[model samples]
Target: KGEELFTGVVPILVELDGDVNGHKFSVRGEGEGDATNGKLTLKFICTTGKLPVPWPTLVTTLVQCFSRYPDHMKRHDFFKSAMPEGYVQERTISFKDDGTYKTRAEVKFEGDTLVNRIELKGIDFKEDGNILGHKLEYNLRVSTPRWERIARVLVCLLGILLSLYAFHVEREHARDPSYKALCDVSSSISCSKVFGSRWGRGFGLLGSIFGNDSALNQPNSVYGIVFYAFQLLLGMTVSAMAALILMTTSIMSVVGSLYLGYILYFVLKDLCVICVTTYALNFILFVLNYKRLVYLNEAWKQKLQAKQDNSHNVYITADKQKNGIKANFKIRHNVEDGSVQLADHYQQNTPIGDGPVLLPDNHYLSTQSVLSKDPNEKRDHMVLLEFVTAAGITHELYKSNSLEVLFQ
Candidate 1:
């Protein structure tokens, strides 16, 4: 009837100690069952004392570490339960004074527990002092597929940093025309001169139509910042639609980069190293996103096809005969074990006026008359049939009035 659920299939225990900014910390935990497809009970007490770092810095470090773990560990409820209520909001220890903190996190997790790019395995263990009567020792193995996603984030971060630098140069050059830039080499290769130009504010000549206040008429570095951040988010998440949208977005960025490159070389007649680097980054991101989109498209198609093949389908046919409309219908149920069942036993042919034709498994078919007010005109009369199935699906079938052969 139901799945034979396994109880206490595996056990896990962990003890860790660390020193962050001279502040000592320890974590001890024990749990049973694997993370995926099984119930995993993990209880840990993370205690730290003699906090030497700034409160905001310590909090940021903790949050960054927490966010680095797989998404299952980052759920709203899981995070809430991981730290006691009022802990995050009330922790206001000054950096000048030594402070202490501890958290007892216990969470019962079920379903896909995305621990990391790691695989869990257990080995037979001998009875020992602390591990007395323990039969298996659980261990995690490394899996590095997630490294590609991390690399993407790093690349985007680099682009963001460069864009911010470019923006700083532009802003400083605007405030003072004599301002010098780190990327300034010679008169022909001055970043400050390039950034100070009207072309730096927006795509030159387009400001007439787009207007200076419009979104497109921002500092070129602003677009880079937005594009890189957008790519970073889309690159991290695995989604078919996201991949497609990211591919298109990256294409646009690359094209925009081409326009800016032309402006820098031919129009501005300046060699901007920052501009060139950002353009190259855009081109690289485009290739990465393009490949991702292809992979996701194929993956999405297979997934969609498999889901469709496992579901049921119904077909209804309505024919216009001289005397009346002939209705024919069939139901094809696809079982999980790759077997097809035709629900022919539920068929009925006899007609009923103004009442739905009943079928097995809460399915039925009904017809409605489509009327027109032009009495003198010769027009095709029609009957609209509705096929209602148990799965809450309703399909419409139209039968047009026509003069045809009748069968007895």
Candidate 2:
């Protein structure tokens, strides 16, 4: 039975000019017999290049106009009575090759009927040369009572209350001493110096005035206000100190020591239990406010991106044109050849020429080499030497002498 009911409803398609504008349709059921089962009557509303009113106003006006149809449709001469004043038909030009002109009308009641239903449909067009043949259908169903109006009013009221409460809490916290301390710390640090002065303090004060107070407390409104004020002051203090460490290069050396000293002094020397309690409270607030901080940072990033986009030139342009230099060298030689050769060897101030000569028979050679050689005069003598050079070396050389004897 469920499946049968679903299949019983007919699907209808309506065709119209794609470029039709300000088009709207309404459906209404009326009669002693459940009007839900009656023959459907379709109507076309209006066309414009653009809706003459704001979107919200247009929607409101359209709803008001459609409500009149229910009373007008009950009459026998409904078609003559129901046509909206100023309604007219206009011809639309087609961008296709066939040259068939398109016509549009605010089609009112199709015929006499106990029940009436209507649908509005239009075609899709692509200015970039794509074609969609079918028209888009938009339908509005009439309801007995207007629930949408009630919901809109409730939401607007809630939003206004929340916004007002946020501002109230912010203003209350602006005069907090903790907030002042944070401003001072932020000013002292070079990295944070930008936010340290009167301007920075004024900005913080303004933020406190506008920011939401829900992060501080819940349930009791007064307590929530006080809690947020305290949180703002404490958070600013820690953030300012951290900023100082980041800004001053010299502060880095003593930062760890100073942090340790501050903790020890607060815990042991000064030892105010209220301070500890407040610190814990501030930490919880920090965790809660993290999302808000992220949102603020995102806003800052968008502003920076906008500035970059608007500026025609930037520092990166100069860096792109700088020149680059590179050098490399390699050498290889055989030691078996009788000819002597030299690779890169350099002396301090004198011009290098084949470098200083290197000799195998020089006095620097150990006498043990001669003793190691065979004493037989008939044996041929041989010597081998090799060296490798690279980079910027300017000169090198190798030399050898030969001895010969003849006997009768």
Candidate 3:
């Protein structure tokens, strides 16, 4: 104002003194502000001096111009705020004194606030001293803390626990006895028969030790220990097999080498039941072992705290019996990892007997009635005799040795 100051100014102008034909002139302005009293304002004026142009066309152009500034502001704010701290500005734009334009926005952070600001220098006026677009810039900032990392970890842990719990419940409700019975086989030609023999029984014994007796018993510490031991044994066996596979030179030198190498092929060829049973056992053992470790750690911490209390006393208590006396019986058939509590019977009184009468040496008895000879029959008479074969043995007899006597 004092002197001719045209050193670095861009001039833009628009004329609206007279209407071209019959159209009127109009002006519009908009502004926004933040909590700190920082504000931005925009102004625009359009004049169609009675021109023979459609009103809609003029309206559309004005609307478009007004919409442009807000979007530019938003983009500026987003990039500045979203970028990490200490990020350098790659390129920028500015208006020149000769009324020319440059691309890209200027970017910089404000202190450690991670807030960035962008500024355009000479974008104020157009060729005829009219405001076309004002200087465009933005301030971006990051506030508060993000817990995404911790949230992700918690989600992963929760997912694993849920999957484990689901599998445990599935095994508990599994009703197909064939799956469990598959392990009852016990022969080499019927390698599948191994599932029906002592090995399968051994595995079953381990299952019972873990209190997975039925769908009723809730998983607890004892089950956890039994499951963990089973897994350790199973893992060691697998590891030994793998080591053998690596060390063996000849085909015959390996134990069950062909069988192990092509288990899938054999399963498809012979429908091997043992393979299926082994898989099921492995899955169940894994779940129980995992739950056991998780529970034990929590229990140990609680126990440690309880011990520190000094005044608290912990005691074991038996359940109150019903009107009828409650009796508990435990039968452990397999010694390696014995079974517990085969059955419970409530009786008004003990049976009248010779107090556990001793049986004759090598005497074998069956639940099926023997052909009772009429008391009048001669001792030497070999009347049509009925003898119980080994296959006639019942499951109850198999579970309890009391039914079978090998008296000396």
Best by TM-score: 1
Candidate 2 regions exceeding 4 Å error are 1-15, 19-38, 41-78, 82-103, 106-149, 176-408
For model 1, residues 86-200, the per-residue Cα lDDT tens digits are: 1111111121112222222122122422121111111221223111222111111111123454567778999999999999998888898677888886888899877778778
What is the Cα-based lDDT of residue 319 in candidate 1? Answer: 22
Question: Which ten residues in a row are the worst by lDDT in model 1?
Answer: 135-144
Query: What tens digits encode model 3's per-residue C-alpha lDDT throughout 247-282?
Result: 332222122223332543444333444344333343
Work out the TM-score per prediction. 0.40, 0.19, 0.16
Q: What are the Cα lDDT values of the candidates?
A: 0.43, 0.24, 0.25
lDDT of 3 at 336: 16
CA error at residue 227 for candidate 3, angstroms: 12
Higher-ranked by TM-score: 2 or 3: 2
Candidate 2 Cα deviation (angstroms), residue 272: 34
| TM-score leaderboard ranking | 1, 2, 3
Clashes of 3: 25
Candidate 3's TM-score reads 0.16
Report the number of backbone clashes for model 1: 0
